[model samples]
Target: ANPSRLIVAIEIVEDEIPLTKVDGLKARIILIEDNTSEVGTQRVLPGTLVSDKDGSQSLVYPLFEAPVSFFGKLGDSNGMRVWSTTTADIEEFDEAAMAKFKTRQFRIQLIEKPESPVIVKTADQQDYLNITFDKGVYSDMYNADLYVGDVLVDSYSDDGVVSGLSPLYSPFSQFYVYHENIDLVRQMIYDTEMRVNPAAAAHTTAPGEIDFLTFLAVDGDPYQGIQVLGPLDGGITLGKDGNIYASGGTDG
Candidate 1:
């Protein structure tokens, strides 16, 4: 049998520097969740790195395992949210181990909002970008509008991504967290009473019901990228606008 366990998560907050050196620095945004259902106990772990044959680096936030809980908002529907659980130890040549570790910080800045929409792009799809929203644009909150250059792509909420709450990842899982199959839940919702509620409905109190998950794909195929938000059993879920919904309950 596969022994599952819960683990502590480390997240990277991106640091901002001058626009001239964005590429030279490795930046990542990480979120951590506790006590999820998919895995059992609690543990701490470091993040992961993907390297090409040429030695170039591709980093992936390690998938996490969360223990199940049902108290407070911590274990409600949002407890299934996924986090980039582990963080890579950034090694700076000049700094000592402790100093290097302490010196590393994720940075964020408030800049002017862009006139154009924010982009969700796979590294390969430079010509096009994906649009993300703030509300759960599914059961009630569904905002699916993306602008690529001047063109807008009308996207619908595909419940397949939101349906499955999963077993969080552990170092025990070799940082490879199990991907839950939400396909059935999606189908069930559509076939069940929820379907009659209108997928693209506008006449609701809360239009975008299910939160949307969108992020810049760091590795793998852009289309095959991960959702940083949504109601998964072990981590955090984000809606179209990068708003957090149902976080910190992974007890399954």
Candidate 2:
């Protein structure tokens, strides 16, 4: 479930029928795509939505499905307010309003909580990614979640992870800047895996058979964590063709 194929457009309160003057009318929405689970959930992917010079609003996204969190820009731009679409009350809309309103509905749900680390790589282009799922619970074909993974990187959203793409650093790299202190993401992964492995082990003989796998060193070799319920020993460093297979499992 790629989380970059979602797009949403909203029509604010209008003075006239067509309501062409969308000067300060803004909407803050969020799109989610949790493919990590079977019941993939999506919503209005959040970020920013600006109008074009001609008063038309558009932006490409890599998400599908909607029931997103939306924030209306009230009073002024700086005074933009946020509210969960699930909880807010929306007024009835005319054709023009409906057109714009529905456009801002799409799904972009992801289960993997992205890591928090800043990379130094730079990109030079733009891309996007999209995700789709069964319609129900949250279904809106025209609306979706759009994630701007690398605006500064000059990259646009595309399918799958938005790293190593281009510009900012590597268009397809993960994380951004590492704090001066610690890598919380790695720690969280370790702790979570440790807890899960033990619990899954109590079930069967080859408890290690059901161990979940994880990556380390950012997104490279020697998957940091693994297990039957966890790795047999908890960890394994690859060795070209020995412990690590060129096309097979780690021999460690």
Candidate 3:
């Protein structure tokens, strides 16, 4: 029965700076507990250094058999030391220790918007944005933002969907289908036009609908939908004017 426990979690807000062989990065350490009675409390340690390799240094506190969290920083002399010849520290974590010792890290990157193209379908006078990409498109690693032109209309985050509704990221295929209301899209178009052209028209009530576009930006980068689309035949269609429009039928 092992009695030791430790957990480590690394969060990188900037993915552009490669962690591999990089310097001057900040590391956060959290000490949870030891073999003694100090069980639930947490302590934040001083900043530490993360060396490239084959060197030795020191620490403000000794690394021991307790729930520990260590990360790397730049230009900080206060850090753990290791020798190229030294093997390594290996310990088994019991069920209890394992519970406390859970550290995970992620290296996020800005993936260019999918070039696979989007198909806008319609049904009963409603519009749906059909986005298809490789398996890597929808991932728990990063959140997605849905944009209609410059305005951020929605966001898909760990907490849940924001701004929009029923945006499905399916594992059944590398595709996402977002069902949007014609009226809602029309509102977006009207709002955008009003912002640019304040003197255009006060189409607040019974405003005429127009064609518009939709895009899904992943991690702040415009992921897709550079092309404009319009609702036609109960769905989206490419217009001759080379713009995406959400067509409102004769009445709408």
Candidate 4:
């Protein structure tokens, strides 16, 4: 299934340490893409960050209830808050800025997360940003229904549907699918490959297969964590080619 996309506009009010003083300073922006998973399985995504006037920041992310983390001085406190959105939610562009499309907006005043080992990357531009199924669950598109209960939300029901985002452009569109519901997604991929390449039938995942989800690295080489089934599952360092390929399953 294709990983759904959403733009998260974080309206942050800084009272602890004014952001302007820290403006243009290097820091890390982390988003917890999977909040359902326990500490063992939960995920943190390093996203690109863009700052706005009046202490606001935005990130383009893939899932909901995911935490937003900001780190400045290493070994100090960082700010974290859960941000939510639905892929089908939000449509329309900012008329003032024809170049930028917008979606649901989330607000969190920057605060400390108690324990934050910071980074030195600066945010100067906009940042950018999955799931499961059964036989009754097979998809015409990719696999893994993203809405799995054990899988992964909140609503902006009260806010007037602010705006819809334009289709993601190349490079970026390819870069954001995240890993969630490993087993189901793997099975679907394996099932499909078995149909196309007989040899693939030998394994649940084909040789060098890299679907399931996409992830970004904050400290190590970027990777597509491989599946290690039968329990005690495991993880890879992936290099990016010039071409951007959208991570898939096959859904809206």
Q: Cα RMSD for candidate 4?
A: 22.3
Candidate 1 residue-wise lDDT, 1-252, digit = tens: 122223323222222223311212222334544433344333323344322223444333332333322334332222111211012224212112212222111111111123232333322233222321211112111122221111111121122345353422211112222222112212222232133334322211121222112222111111111212223423333322332222443333
Q: Give each model a TM-score.
A: 0.20, 0.16, 0.16, 0.20
Where model 1 places Cα greater than 4 Å from the true spot, the runs are: 1-23, 36-46, 51-241, 246-252
Model 2 agreement with the true structure over 184-243: per-residue lDDT tens digits: 222333344345333422221121111111122111222122211122422222211111
Candidate 3 matches the true fold with a TM-score of 0.16
Worst 10 residues of 3 by lDDT: 78-87
Give me the overall lDDT of model 2. 0.22
Better of 2 and 4 by TM-score: 4
lDDT, ranked from best to worst: 1, 4, 2, 3
TM-score of 1: 0.20
Candidate 1 vs candidate 3, TM-score winner = 1
In candidate 3, what are the lDDT values of residues 146-222, reduced to their tens digit?
11111111111112345254543211111111123223333443454354444434322222213222221211221
How many clashing pairs does model 3 include? 17
